[PDB]
Amino acid sequence: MATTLIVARLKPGDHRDQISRLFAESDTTELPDLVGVQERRLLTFKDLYFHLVRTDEALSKTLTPQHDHPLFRSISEAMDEYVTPYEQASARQFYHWKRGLGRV
Amino acid sequence: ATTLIVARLKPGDHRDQISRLFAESDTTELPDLVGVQERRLLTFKDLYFHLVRTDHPLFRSISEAMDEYVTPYEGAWGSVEQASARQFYHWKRGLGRVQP
Protein backbone atom coordinates (compact mmCIF):
# COMPACT_ATOMS: atom_id res chain seq x y z
CA MET A 1 0.00 0.00 0.00
CA ALA A 2 0.92 3.64 -0.51
CA THR A 3 -1.04 6.75 0.47
CA THR A 4 -0.31 10.05 -1.28
CA LEU A 5 -1.62 13.53 -0.44
CA ILE A 6 -1.57 15.88 -3.44
CA VAL A 7 -2.03 19.60 -2.86
CA ALA A 8 -2.88 22.52 -5.13
CA ARG A 9 -4.46 25.96 -4.90
CA LEU A 10 -8.05 26.42 -6.05
CA LYS A 11 -8.80 29.18 -8.53
CA PRO A 12 -11.48 31.70 -7.46
CA GLY A 13 -15.02 30.32 -7.35
CA ASP A 14 -16.62 27.11 -6.12
CA HIS A 15 -15.40 24.33 -8.40
CA ARG A 16 -16.21 21.38 -6.15
CA ASP A 17 -19.09 20.01 -8.25
CA GLN A 18 -16.94 20.22 -11.39
CA ILE A 19 -13.86 18.60 -9.80
CA SER A 20 -16.03 15.90 -8.21
CA ARG A 21 -17.52 15.16 -11.62
CA LEU A 22 -14.13 14.88 -13.33
CA PHE A 23 -13.01 12.28 -10.80
CA ALA A 24 -16.35 10.43 -10.62
CA GLU A 25 -16.36 9.97 -14.40
CA SER A 26 -12.68 8.94 -14.41
CA ASP A 27 -13.34 6.44 -11.62
CA THR A 28 -15.97 4.66 -13.74
CA THR A 29 -13.26 3.84 -16.31
CA GLU A 30 -10.44 1.34 -16.07
CA LEU A 31 -8.10 4.19 -14.99
CA PRO A 32 -8.28 3.35 -11.26
CA ASP A 33 -7.68 -0.26 -12.29
CA LEU A 34 -4.57 0.65 -14.29
CA VAL A 35 -3.23 2.67 -11.36
CA GLY A 36 -4.27 0.23 -8.64
CA VAL A 37 -6.39 2.68 -6.65
CA GLN A 38 -7.97 1.28 -3.50
CA GLU A 39 -9.58 4.47 -2.19
CA ARG A 40 -9.71 8.13 -3.15
CA ARG A 41 -10.86 11.25 -1.31
CA LEU A 42 -10.94 14.89 -2.44
CA LEU A 43 -11.10 17.72 0.08
CA THR A 44 -10.89 21.49 0.24
CA PHE A 45 -9.75 23.91 2.91
CA LYS A 46 -10.04 27.63 2.13
CA ASP A 47 -8.20 28.07 -1.21
CA LEU A 48 -6.49 24.63 -0.97
CA TYR A 49 -7.39 21.50 -2.93
CA PHE A 50 -6.45 18.04 -1.61
CA HIS A 51 -6.39 14.71 -3.43
CA LEU A 52 -5.82 11.81 -1.02
CA VAL A 53 -5.28 8.48 -2.81
CA ARG A 54 -4.33 4.98 -1.60
CA THR A 55 -2.83 2.67 -4.22
CA ASP A 56 -1.78 -0.97 -4.13
CA GLU A 57 1.07 -2.41 -6.17
CA ALA A 58 -0.58 -5.85 -6.37
CA LEU A 59 -3.86 -4.71 -7.96
CA SER A 60 -2.49 -4.03 -11.45
CA LYS A 61 0.40 -4.73 -13.78
CA THR A 62 3.13 -2.11 -13.85
CA LEU A 63 3.24 0.10 -16.94
CA THR A 64 6.15 2.48 -17.60
CA PRO A 65 4.78 4.50 -20.51
CA GLN A 66 6.75 7.09 -22.43
CA HIS A 67 3.68 9.36 -22.63
CA ASP A 68 0.68 10.07 -20.45
CA HIS A 69 -2.28 7.80 -20.98
CA PRO A 70 -5.05 9.81 -22.77
CA LEU A 71 -7.36 9.37 -19.77
CA PHE A 72 -4.76 10.83 -17.43
CA ARG A 73 -4.00 13.63 -19.88
CA SER A 74 -7.73 14.42 -19.99
CA ILE A 75 -8.32 14.76 -16.24
CA SER A 76 -4.95 16.46 -15.74
CA GLU A 77 -5.61 19.19 -18.30
CA ALA A 78 -9.26 19.50 -17.22
CA MET A 79 -8.18 20.12 -13.63
CA ASP A 80 -6.04 23.03 -14.87
CA GLU A 81 -9.27 25.04 -15.17
CA TYR A 82 -9.90 24.81 -11.43
CA VAL A 83 -6.49 24.49 -9.73
CA THR A 84 -2.98 25.94 -10.02
CA PRO A 85 0.23 24.83 -8.27
CA TYR A 86 0.38 26.15 -4.72
CA GLU A 87 4.00 26.92 -5.66
CA GLN A 88 6.09 17.77 -7.20
CA ALA A 89 2.65 18.47 -5.72
CA SER A 90 2.69 15.67 -3.14
CA ALA A 91 3.08 16.35 0.55
CA ARG A 92 6.07 14.74 2.27
CA GLN A 93 5.15 12.35 5.10
CA PHE A 94 7.39 12.44 8.20
CA TYR A 95 5.29 10.55 10.81
CA HIS A 96 3.10 7.46 10.54
CA TRP A 97 1.38 5.61 13.40
CA LYS A 98 -1.01 2.73 12.90
CA ARG A 99 -3.14 0.75 15.34
CA GLY A 100 -1.54 -2.65 15.85
CA LEU A 101 1.84 -1.46 14.57
CA GLY A 102 2.77 1.63 16.55
CA ARG A 103 5.16 3.93 14.74
CA VAL A 104 5.71 2.80 11.16
CA ALA B 1 -13.88 8.97 9.74
CA THR B 2 -10.90 10.69 8.11
CA THR B 3 -9.92 14.20 9.18
CA LEU B 4 -7.29 16.47 7.64
CA ILE B 5 -6.09 19.46 9.70
CA VAL B 6 -4.13 22.23 7.97
CA ALA B 7 -1.80 24.82 9.46
CA ARG B 8 1.06 26.99 8.28
CA LEU B 9 4.57 26.04 9.34
CA LYS B 10 6.67 28.54 11.22
CA PRO B 11 10.16 29.06 9.74
CA GLY B 12 12.66 26.25 10.26
CA ASP B 13 12.56 22.44 10.26
CA HIS B 14 10.32 21.19 13.09
CA ARG B 15 9.77 17.60 11.91
CA ASP B 16 11.97 16.11 14.64
CA GLN B 17 10.20 18.04 17.40
CA ILE B 18 6.72 17.38 16.03
CA SER B 19 7.53 13.68 15.69
CA ARG B 20 8.75 13.61 19.30
CA LEU B 21 5.48 15.19 20.48
CA PHE B 22 3.27 12.65 18.72
CA ALA B 23 5.61 9.75 19.56
CA GLU B 24 5.05 10.59 23.24
CA SER B 25 1.34 11.19 22.69
CA ASP B 26 0.70 7.97 20.75
CA THR B 27 2.20 5.89 23.60
CA THR B 28 -0.51 7.21 25.95
CA GLU B 29 -4.12 6.08 26.06
CA LEU B 30 -5.03 9.01 23.77
CA PRO B 31 -5.44 6.99 20.52
CA ASP B 32 -7.59 4.51 22.46
CA LEU B 33 -9.82 7.33 23.72
CA VAL B 34 -10.24 8.99 20.32
CA GLY B 35 -10.41 5.66 18.50
CA VAL B 36 -7.50 6.46 16.20
CA GLN B 37 -6.77 3.77 13.63
CA GLU B 38 -4.00 5.64 11.79
CA ARG B 39 -2.21 9.00 11.94
CA ARG B 40 -0.03 10.65 9.29
CA LEU B 41 1.81 13.97 9.60
CA LEU B 42 3.05 15.64 6.42
CA THR B 43 4.54 18.90 5.15
CA PHE B 44 4.39 20.69 1.80
CA LYS B 45 6.26 23.97 1.36
CA ASP B 46 5.09 26.10 4.32
CA LEU B 47 2.12 23.82 5.08
CA TYR B 48 1.53 21.31 7.86
CA PHE B 49 -1.02 18.51 7.57
CA HIS B 50 -2.29 16.20 10.31
CA LEU B 51 -4.25 13.30 8.80
CA VAL B 52 -6.13 11.02 11.21
CA ARG B 53 -8.45 8.06 10.62
CA THR B 54 -10.68 7.14 13.56
CA ASP B 55 -11.13 19.66 27.48
CA HIS B 56 -9.06 16.52 28.03
CA PRO B 57 -5.46 16.96 29.24
CA LEU B 58 -4.03 14.52 26.68
CA PHE B 59 -5.64 16.44 23.81
CA ARG B 60 -4.74 19.88 25.17
CA SER B 61 -1.08 19.00 25.72
CA ILE B 62 -0.50 18.38 22.02
CA SER B 63 -2.38 21.57 21.10
CA GLU B 64 -0.18 23.57 23.47
CA ALA B 65 3.09 22.07 22.20
CA MET B 66 2.27 22.64 18.52
CA ASP B 67 2.22 26.42 19.10
CA GLU B 68 6.02 26.54 18.83
CA TYR B 69 5.82 25.16 15.28
CA VAL B 70 2.59 26.22 13.50
CA THR B 71 0.34 29.25 13.01
CA PRO B 72 -3.21 29.32 11.60
CA TYR B 73 -3.33 29.17 7.80
CA GLU B 74 -5.65 32.22 7.78
CA GLY B 75 -5.34 34.75 10.57
CA ALA B 76 -8.63 36.66 10.43
CA TRP B 77 -10.49 34.04 12.52
CA GLY B 78 -7.37 32.03 13.29
CA SER B 79 -7.68 29.45 16.10
CA VAL B 80 -11.47 29.76 16.43
CA GLU B 81 -12.66 28.68 13.00
CA GLN B 82 -12.19 25.07 12.03
CA ALA B 83 -8.77 24.12 10.66
CA SER B 84 -10.02 20.84 9.15
CA ALA B 85 -10.62 20.33 5.44
CA ARG B 86 -14.05 19.35 4.10
CA GLN B 87 -14.33 16.17 2.05
CA PHE B 88 -16.43 16.43 -1.11
CA TYR B 89 -15.56 13.17 -2.92
CA HIS B 90 -14.94 9.56 -1.84
CA TRP B 91 -14.51 6.46 -4.00
CA LYS B 92 -13.60 3.05 -2.61
CA ARG B 93 -12.77 -0.10 -4.53
CA GLY B 94 -15.50 -2.66 -3.93
CA LEU B 95 -18.31 -0.15 -3.41
CA GLY B 96 -17.34 2.41 -6.03
CA ARG B 97 -19.16 5.63 -5.13
CA VAL B 98 -19.16 6.67 -1.49
CA GLN B 99 -19.61 10.44 -1.84
CA PRO B 100 -21.65 11.47 -3.73
Resolution (A): 1.3
For chain A, list the domains and their CATH numbers: 2-103 (3.30.70.1090)
Cα–Cα distance list, B57 to A49, A51, B33, B50 (Å): 33, 33, 12, 19
Contacts of A38 in chain B (CB under 8 A): 92-93
Determine the residue among A18, A22, A44, A95 to mutate to test chain B binding: the one whose Cβ has the most chain B Cβ atoms within 10 Å: A95
Collapsing DSSP to helix, strand or coil, B36 comes out as coil
Closest CA relative to residue A28, chosen from B35, B83, B96: B96
A58 shares contact with chain B (CB less than 8 Å): no
Q: Are A20 and B89 in contact (CB under 8 A)?
A: yes
Query: Where would I find the H helices in chain B?
Result: 15-25, 30-34, 57-65
Cα–Cα distance list, B84 to A36, B6, B63 (Å): 28, 6, 14
Closest CA relative to residue A48, chosen from A69, A19, A78: A19
Contacts of B36 in chain A (CB under 8 A): 97, 99
CB-CB: which of B4, B23, B91 is closest to A40? B91
